[PDB]
Amino acid sequence: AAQAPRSMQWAVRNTQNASSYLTSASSLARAYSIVIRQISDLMGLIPKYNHLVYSQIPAAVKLTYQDAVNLQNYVEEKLIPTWNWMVSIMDSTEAQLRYGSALASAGDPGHPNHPLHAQGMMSARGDFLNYALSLMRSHNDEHSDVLPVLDVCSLKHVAYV
Amino acid sequence: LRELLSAKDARGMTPFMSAVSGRAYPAAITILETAQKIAKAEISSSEKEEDVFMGMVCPSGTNPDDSPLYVLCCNDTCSFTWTGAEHINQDIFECRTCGLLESLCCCTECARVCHKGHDCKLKRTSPTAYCDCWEKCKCKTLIAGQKSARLDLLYRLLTATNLVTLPNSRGEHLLLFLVQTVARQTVEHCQYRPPDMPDHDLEPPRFAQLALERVLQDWNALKSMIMFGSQENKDPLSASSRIGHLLPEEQVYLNQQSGTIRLDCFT
Numbered sequence: 001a002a003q004a005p006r007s008m009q010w011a012v013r014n015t016q017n018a019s020s021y022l023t024s025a026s027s028l029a030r031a032y033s034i035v036i037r038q039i040s041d042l043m044g045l046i047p048k049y050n051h052l053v054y055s056q057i058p059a060a061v062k063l064t065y066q067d068a069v070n071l072q073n074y075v076e077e078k079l080i081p082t083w084n085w086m087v088s089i090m091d092s093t094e095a096q097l098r099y100g101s102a103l104a105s106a107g108d109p110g111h112p113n114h115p116l117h118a119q120g121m122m123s124a125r126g127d128f129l130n131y132a133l134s135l136m137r138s139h140n141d142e143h144s145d146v147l148p149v150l151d152v153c154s155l156k157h158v159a160y161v
Numbered sequence: 162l163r164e165l166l167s168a169k170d171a172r173g174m175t176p177f178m179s180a181v182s183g184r185a186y187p188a189a190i191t192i193l194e195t196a197q198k199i200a201k202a203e204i205s206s207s208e209k210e211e212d213v214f215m216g217m218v219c220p221s222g223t224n225p226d227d228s229p230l231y232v233l234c235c236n237d238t239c240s241f242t243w244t245g246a247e248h249i250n251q252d253i254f255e256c257r258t259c260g261l262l263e264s265l266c267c268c269t270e271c272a273r274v275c276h277k278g279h280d281c282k283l284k285r286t287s288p289t290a291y292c293d294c295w296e297k298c299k300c301k302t303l304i305a306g307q308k309s310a311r312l313d314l315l316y317r318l319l320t321a322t323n324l325v326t327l328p329n330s331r332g333e334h335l336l337l338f339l340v341q342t343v344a345r346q347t348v349e350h351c352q353y354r355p356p357d358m359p360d361h362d363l364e365p366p367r368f369a370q371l372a373l374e375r376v377l378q379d380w381n382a383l384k385s386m387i388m389f390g391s392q393e394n395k396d397p398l399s400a401s402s403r404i405g406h407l408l409p410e411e412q413v414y415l416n417q418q419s420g421t422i423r424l425d426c427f428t
């Protein structure tokens with residue numbers, strides 16, 4: 001994982017076998033992508049099929065333009081849920097990134113909290129509370145003068161999708 | 162009279178603002194009544210009644226740190242008037258402009274008024290200390306004045322003027338200033354005990370609590386505090402307040418959020 005440039009480093013959990021949930025979440029997304037590619041490939045063959053049956057294989061199913069329509073109708077429907085889930089998360093992420101950049105432009109880099117400038121239990125409870133407070137603020141646009149709390153390294157499964 | 166009361170001294174202050182700065186609350190009252198009469202006498206002019214009145218009370222271009230309603234609240238006594246030379250746990254400041262370097266110090270009120278405009282910093286030594294300012298300097302917080310007049314003047318200002326809406330020189334709305342004051346006094350005053358050096362053994366001030374209770378009854382004060390950090394109620398200081406010089410895309414993002422750090426810190 002090659003490391004991000006300074007205009008985006010603030011948005012990464014970084015330093016400026018056991019099981020894990022994220023392993024399994026990621027590998028299922030990896031596996032999902034394969035099937036989507038294969039479906040696309042088969043849809044890719046349809047125009048040439050009246051040649052790529054008989055010139056290639058002893059026997060195969062006859063099919064027609066009307067059937068291609070209905071297949072395509074069916075395929076689109078089955079993707080809508082995952083599409084909505086992808087889109088909504090991506091928009092939310094891009095918004096948080098662009099806002100953090102605009103604030104980095106308008107703010108003062110002399111301040112120790114500027115994105116370009118920047119204990120156990122209590123620091124951890126600090127991290128968690130900063131996160132919960134940033135979450136509650138963000139819902140109503142009550143977040144005008146501090147960086148949104150975010151990490152992108154969890155989002156590997158939306159990257160695959 | 163209008164000219165004499167709108168004329169500014171060598172520090173920018175009208176006679177009214179001077180009466181407040183000097184704790185001459187009955188004189189401030191006398192002038193403030195008179196200033197209302199004067200503004201109400203010149204209603205025949207092409208100016209609005211208010212412009213004249215604001216000119217005499219708190220003139221345009223006044224540094225916010227000198228706005229009278231704020232100054233009246235800052236006018237408390239030095240802790241030494243009630244602690245004497247006893248050591249109590251309180252906040253303390255060094256003042257380098259005055260040679261009050263890190264072994265020495267003054268209490269919060271001296272730092273706010275006796276050392277206004279100096280290099281002063283919040284000190285890191287133990288809080289169990291009295292305040293050296295009455296001994297090392299010409300300390301202006303030793304005199305209480307007339308308490309009943311101080312309170313009467315506050316009531317009048319709150320109904321006479323829109324000054325409640327201004328933030329101070331650190332972006333603190335007046336209410337956020339008062340409530341921090343009460344919270345601080347609550348700890349300091351619980352250490353008080355009944356019994357060439359200045360008059361000690363006085364009773365501690367309850368003005369901040371009385372002032373907080375009265376201000377909280379004013380709709381304008383309350384609305385002005387709760388709407389703080391809205392796009393209309395633009396915080397002048399430390400708060401992304403200059404934006405027009407950035408390219409338009411970053412403005413359309415950065416206008417959309419709104420602030421609550423101070424409203425949350427108050428609540």
Ligand SMILES: [Zn+2]
Binds near residue numbers: 269302
């Ligand atoms: Zn003092």
Ligand SMILES: [Zn+2]
Binds near residue numbers: 267270272275295303
């Ligand atoms: Zn003093």
Ligand SMILES: [Zn+2]
Binds near residue numbers: 279
């Ligand atoms: Zn000083």
